[PDB]
Design a protein around this nucleic acid. Sequence first.
DNA 1: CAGCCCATGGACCCAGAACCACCCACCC
DNA 2: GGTGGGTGGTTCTGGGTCCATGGGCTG
DNA 3: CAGCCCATGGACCCAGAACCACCCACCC
DNA 4: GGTGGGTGGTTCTGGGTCCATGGGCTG
Lengths: 1011, 146, 143
Amino acid sequence: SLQLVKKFQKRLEDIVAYGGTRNESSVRAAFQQLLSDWAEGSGLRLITEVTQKAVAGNNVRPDGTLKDSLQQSRGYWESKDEADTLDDEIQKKLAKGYPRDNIIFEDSRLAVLMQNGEEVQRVDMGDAGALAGLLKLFFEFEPPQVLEFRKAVDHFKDEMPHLLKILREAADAAEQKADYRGERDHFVEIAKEAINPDFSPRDAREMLIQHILTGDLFTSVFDNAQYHEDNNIAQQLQQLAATFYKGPVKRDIAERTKRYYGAIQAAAAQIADHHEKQRFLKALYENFYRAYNPAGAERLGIFYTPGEIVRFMIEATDTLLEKHFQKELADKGVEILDPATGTGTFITELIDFLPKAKLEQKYREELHCNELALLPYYIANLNIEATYAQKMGRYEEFRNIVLVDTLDNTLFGSVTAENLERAKRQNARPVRVIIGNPPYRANQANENDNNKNREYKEIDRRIKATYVAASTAQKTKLYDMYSRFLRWATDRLKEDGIVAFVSNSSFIDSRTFDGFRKEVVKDFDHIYILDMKGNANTSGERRKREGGNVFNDQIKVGVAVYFLVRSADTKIWYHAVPDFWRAREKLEWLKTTKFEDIEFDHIRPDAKHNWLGQVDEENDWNEFLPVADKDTKQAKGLGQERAIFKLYSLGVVTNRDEWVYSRAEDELADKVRYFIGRYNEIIKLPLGDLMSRNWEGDIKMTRATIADAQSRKSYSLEKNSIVPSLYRPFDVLKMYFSKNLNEMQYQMPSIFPKGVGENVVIALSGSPAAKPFQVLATDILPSLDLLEKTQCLPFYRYTMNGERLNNITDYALKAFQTHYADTSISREDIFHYVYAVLHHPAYREKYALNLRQEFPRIPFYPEFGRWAAWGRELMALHIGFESVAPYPLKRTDEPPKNDTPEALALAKKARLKVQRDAAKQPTGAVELDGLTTLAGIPAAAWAYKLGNRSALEWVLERHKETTPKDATIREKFNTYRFADHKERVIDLLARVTTVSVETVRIVGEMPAETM
Amino acid sequence: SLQLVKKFQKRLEDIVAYGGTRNESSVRAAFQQLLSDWAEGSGLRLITEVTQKAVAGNNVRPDGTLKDSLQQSRGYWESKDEADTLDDEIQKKLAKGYPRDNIIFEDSRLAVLMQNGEEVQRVDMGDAGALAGLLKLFFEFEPPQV
Amino acid sequence: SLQLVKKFQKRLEDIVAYGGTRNESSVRAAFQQLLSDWAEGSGLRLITEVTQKAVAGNNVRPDGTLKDSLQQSRGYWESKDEADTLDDEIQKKLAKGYPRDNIIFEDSRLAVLMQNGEEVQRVDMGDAGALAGLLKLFFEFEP
DNA sequence: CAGCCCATGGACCCAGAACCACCCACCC
DNA sequence: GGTGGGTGGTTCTGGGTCCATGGGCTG
DNA sequence: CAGCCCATGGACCCAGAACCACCCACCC
DNA sequence: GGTGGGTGGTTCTGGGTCCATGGGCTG
Ligand SMILES: C[S@@+](CC[C@H](N)C(=O)[O-])C[C@H]1O[C@@H](n2cnc3c(N)ncnc32)[C@H](O)[C@@H]1O
Ligand SMILES: [Ca+2]
Ligand SMILES: [Ca+2]
Ligand SMILES: [Ca+2]
């Protein structure tokens, strides 16, 4: 520190005042003591006159050397006399071979650092600032050896499958034994009451692999072999491993795994700081699952939390412990649990935070840990004990970690009687801080994956009685593992506690989490949210604002560090991180910032318990509802009718778009044919195969199929079911509209009967509108992904054995007619007028948050006929995008590069792409393929935007050569070539170009007056 | 004095644990520190290696030279590597032309204080209480005028 | 025969262990040796990266160029990285004007032989007896 | 109660692009 | 002698989807 | 036989001794 | 500005003892 620099300057004058000596033998003693006191802080020590060898060999003698604990030099020092010039003698000493890696050439007047033969800092001495800078840089230089431990970490991160194959082969060939087969069926039984109630023989094989793999690395890379001989869990498992890992077999496997473990153990031996070796502990923790069992990596959500977030989350809880309660982390009674410990970074950084006096009492019985998987548990325990050795002194077994399912520990942890009673003492403790990082998993990829987060009966029961109870959300996503951990944390916490978790930022603002907030403010006295954004399941302008991910761009969900204190009305404090920041900036503001120095802005919850997105009320929002909650649910009793349209619908959902959304008529029939057949094969498959999904995933089986499959309800093709369907904006596709395949129809056969019917619908968007609110009047069967949250308001709702019953309810007609004193306004008139107002830009501009949360209340604007006629031109030119006469574009062809058929075929590939300028501006040119370029698109045609993508861009993206995400369709049914849809794409573009310009014209005639 | 001597010990093991050498040049950093720190509070200062003259010679060079605020030498220290037998390194030293007015002859685990013409008491450096008593006298020795 | 074929595999396995790199730059050395030896043993050679010129006038560079005594070309070898669908990189190479007479488009896992313009054979390069078959055919394809 | 509607937000990854090193043909 | 061009490797950086699955309700 | 006599080669240290490295006090 | 003494590491290298302990006499 600069304090030490000042002390050295006081010793420099003392030597030339008491001794009055100007000899090198006496003017250097000051710097000797200075480096010595700085070094003892870093972890090295300065040893004088170490005779070293030079490049020539001549024994040289740098006056000092920064020796390590493995006696390796991290640097050197050559003090010369105050008088002699340094730059000349630097170049004369260096000639004899003096070191150049990290030498501080000093002369009791000027200190220079030549690092890598390179002068970096020539700080003239006698400095109250940059001299401290110099010594910091010197004592923090990276040894050439640490950058190789980094290189070897990455290689192992990529030759892990090859190494794991060896261990996999071993465990299969051990199943030939009757000692393995007998003991691996008793492991399963003891582990069908402790960690996994569905412990499979293949889960026991996974544990065996992890135990052995980490055993070889713990004894070499980390030198701690005694860990496995002491850890209760290891012993219960060697009982199962030394059944096959013995004598010859043991030697064979070990010598076959050497061409992978070798290098890591030849660079991990030349570094001697555990904090650097922790980078491999993390790497192994994650990579193993991604190279072996990604199914586990999903539900467990194995991930590492960057140190910056952890350290912030520790200092912030310490600076809140005296604020609302009255204590300090290093007090007595601050029992800090941490469910979900993973690599242990939440208790290793706590050890480093705690002072080196009370640490003993805290390490012994106040720091607690909880884990479910084996690899994380082992890594965490070893890490904590090694951090204790680096901080306090003599290794002392951490005896507070456990292997229990936290959400189920409410005979848990019975794998070892030790961990059982360890989790019993944990349960009995009065815990006060609950810090940690929960899994944010919620739902599986596709239902052919077969991976649901274990239903925690006890824990989800209180969620149902608390978070879910208040939330009236039609869909319920409050059963997320993050919210389950929150429930467990609030119930462990007795009184005066600080739950600090980092999780998905959906809790702050989601229709689903509207009631979570309501209940959470009752169980707490102060809430301190810190939105770190970084959401990536969004597109367009939104993905820009969110920016980089505070989890090293490894996840796509939003992240928010929240601290809910309970001093036992609340005060919701909030600080959104500046938008458009990248990840490395976000994780720097989280190291260089103190919690008490951020400026939180009091949020006062609204009636709907919405924290963000607070609707403004000064606006004239309340007008004429298009559909109301009770217009769709009216019991067909004319009277409660309270809006314009009555029964509205939603975009068709299928769940098997790989076997339902195609271009050609028979192309779909073929994908569906194989299905209608393989479902019928899965049907003849046993009742057990139907009950526990023991069949094949060649075809997309969603819940409906899995169920009519259990009832053995064979299917059969009805060619009538296939119907033209507008998949995306201006993209007419085909679709098997049947009850067999499509998961939810949403009263679509009541709006568009039997796929083919004649009602004209207006597609709208939903709420909250993630993508900008959009409007598409369509006459073709729609899709849920056509517009953002597609919700279709129809015009002539049909009935069963019935007919076009006008939809605009009669109440709406009367109100409109009487208001404009017309008594002649028709249903079409209203329809068209509504479309014009919806399209009106200033309408959705004034009502921004009003529209993204409830149904767009259409205002009664001064003239009716004017807007009715506006929305008439709009309607027609958007219901007939394939008749609108084209706009004259220009095809400028060219020849292929060479004459090889290979080049010609590669020049027929859909390189469909917009041609943006050096300033991201479309030039009005679309490169169709490598032989044709269409140009002349007007710039006003790029303006019309249905979502986050212009109408023209939609057509290109919906005709690009994409590879199906299914394998059975990437091999037998991928037949779409840009060659098939060549001139049809050009034809579509020409007509859509005209449509785009026309829309802008009509929408421009509309003013800025907003009723 | 007692806590200070109990830290000279720590930084002795540290020279060998970090460096890995027992050559005199490197193991002398611990005793240097101890002496200088003790002298600071008392008022004096150990200025290391101040070439001191001799009765018979061109010049000699002690490795420690307590020099007071008025540049006057009142005590010295000559280190020793473990290899040499300290006693015979003493006669070798006090023959070339080394001072005897006040000098600490220390090896690494045993130390004598030849003070003003005669040895006082020989103490081992492993014992904190012993080295304390002796260094006190190296620092509480004052000339006759005082 | 099969001995030299097995030797190639051994060499490649040492490259991905003593260096750890599975990049072709280092892996090719193994196949370079195998092709050069079977050749000398059947009256030929494997001169490496000899720039050929295409009909369109592109100076192409195959990784190999089995040439014979009067300095004429008889075959051409081209090895792609073990980290790409081979049947995709074959097209890219041929679309620069790559020779189609007798070319071994080979990735570390599969070896495809083209002659005139048709895939004559594709073998798992791991099976010793199978490669031994394909390699012999390439060295015996006479104009 | 049991099928049948109605939600609603979801722990990354991989193609280009820039660019770099090395050597070869080809202007110089 | 440079230099642009073939071959190959190494970092960045930009940028975004259909569909699972519990509640609420007819019936 | 016990208790005197007669052999007969022995699994290394080390004290200088150069000799150099650094560097301060003295001749240049 | 050299330039040797003077302290310290460093690595060669030349050179050389008293005395155990079985067997054969041996009284
Ligand atoms: C994000 S990781 C832990 C994070 C940790 N701070 C780190 O940096 O590695 C989530 C971990 O929670 C553990 N875990 C413990 N109890 C769990 C439970 N009941 N449900 C899910 N995961 C649990 C899993 O084994 C998994 O390794
Ligand atoms: Ca020096
Ligand atoms: Ca000395
Ligand atoms: Ca190649």
